Write a protein that binds this ligand. Structure first.
Ligand SMILES: *[C]C1(*)(*)(*)=C(*)(*)(*)(C(*)(*)C2(*)(*)(*)=N(*)(*)C(*)(*)(*)(=O*)C(*)(*)(*)([C])C2(*)(*)(*)[C@@](*)(*)=C(*)*)N(*)(*)C(*)(*)(*)(C(*)(*)C2(*)(*)(*)=C(*)(*)(*)(C(*)(*)C(*)(*)C(*)(*)(*)(O*)=O*)C(*)(*)(*)([C]*)=C(*)(*)(*)(C(*)(*)C3(*)(*)(*)=N(*)(*)C(*)(*)(*)(=O*)C(*)(*)(*)(C(*)(*)=[C]*)=C3(*)(*)(*)[C]*)N2(*)*)=C1(*)(*)(*)C(*)(*)C(*)(*)C(*)(*)(*)(O*)=O*
Ligand SMILES: [Cl-]
Ligand SMILES: [Cl-]
Length: 301
């Protein structure tokens, strides 16, 4: 198709995911899958997925999520551990409910317990006793690097006009240093900063990925695009991916620092090969970011 009609987006309405997980959307009157990422049946080792009742999916997903489905104030979002498919694989399933559109379950392959409590006790002490923002942010990048193994870790700070600053940095020997560089606010646009106040960790596994569309794209329950604000698998803005490609970065982890309800900064990690961190380690990063934000609050008071 050509002609005139043929031929800086609402990032939370991406309609697609990154390929290192599967996404199911479930209607809760009948507990059937009403949307799924196009890769779901392959990824989960299932013959079919769309339209299938959870009870009929090979494995124990339904039994595992049942205890968390009734309304509760201390409930979702919540992660469960289950087995799915034939051949059966273990998964971690992250569940949340968008405002409308049903119940979202995002599934990643499970791995072993991560045993970082002995690293964490002293990390927490270093955080709670940091005497300045300089000290705190320097310790932050070191701690994150140790925990996560990324080739570069930065604290990226926002000012009141939204401009960005690389306030702290560590990196593997021999790499480029971005320490102290400034960037325009347009590089992390307002709608993205607002999203990051609600969705506190983002992982981009491979910047060169091909997005995996939701099928159907539009929610059967709303007739609108699915609100993917809370989706950890959400596909990321092409404009941002191009930015990272032009720097040669292959993978990223970002963790929000939220102070007084505002996005104060990000812990931003780069890797020069594809990289994924699983749910348990993401949870630790989030706990660390809350501890750091508490200390920023005190230091700024
Ligand atoms: C839509 C969107 C953009 C847009 C965008 N970036 C640009 O460079 C231009 C001016 C414009 C359009 C192309 N940027 C971002 C996100 C973004 C983040 C947050 C990433 C994350 O994983 O949470 C960050 C940290 C940056 C900028 C940088 N990252 C770096 O490491 C460095 C420098 C060392 C910079 C400057 N941009 C989005 C939203 C992406 C999404 O879908 O969540
Ligand atoms: Cl529903
Ligand atoms: Cl079951």
């Amino acid at each position: 198709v050509a002609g005139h009609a043929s031929g800086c987006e609402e990032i939370h309405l991406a309609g697609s995911i990154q390929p290192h997980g599967a996404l199911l959307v479930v209607s809760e009157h009948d507990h059937r899958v009403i949307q799924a990422s196009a890769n779901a049946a392959e990824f989960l080792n299932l013959g079919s997925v769309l339209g299938v009742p959870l009870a009929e999916i090979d494995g124990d997903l339904l039994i595992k999520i049942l205890p968390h489905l009734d309304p509760t104030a201390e409930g979702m979002p919540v992660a469960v551990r289950c087995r799915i498919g034939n051949p059966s694989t273990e998964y971690c399933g992250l569940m949340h409910r968008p405002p409308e559109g049903g119940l979202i379950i995002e599934l990643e392959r499970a791995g072993p317990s991560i045993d970082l409590s002995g690293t964490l006790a002293p990390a927490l002490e270093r955080i709670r006793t940091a005497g300045s923002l300089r000290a705190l942010c320097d310790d932050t990048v070191l701690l994150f690097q140790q925990c996560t193994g990324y080739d570069r870790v930065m604290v990226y700070r926002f000012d009141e006009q939204g401009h960005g600053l690389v306030f702290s940095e560590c990196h593997v020997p021999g790499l480029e240093s971005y320490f102290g560089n400034r960037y325009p606010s347009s590089t992390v646009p307002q709608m993205a900063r607002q999203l990051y106040v609600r969705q506190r960790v983002r992982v981009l596994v491979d910047v060169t990925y091909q997005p995996v569309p939701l099928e159907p794209r539009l929610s059967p329950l709303t007739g609108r695009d699915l609100d993917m604000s809370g989706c950890f698998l959400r596909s990321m803005s092409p404009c941002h991916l191009q930015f990272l490609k032009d720097m040669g970065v292959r993978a990223t982890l970002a963790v929000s620092l939220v102070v007084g309800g505002k996005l104060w900064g990000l812990v931003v990690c780069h890797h020069y090969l594809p990289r994924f961190i699983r749910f348990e380690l993401r949870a630790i990063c989030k706990r660390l970011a809350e501890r750091i934000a508490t200390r920023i609050t005190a230091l700024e008071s």
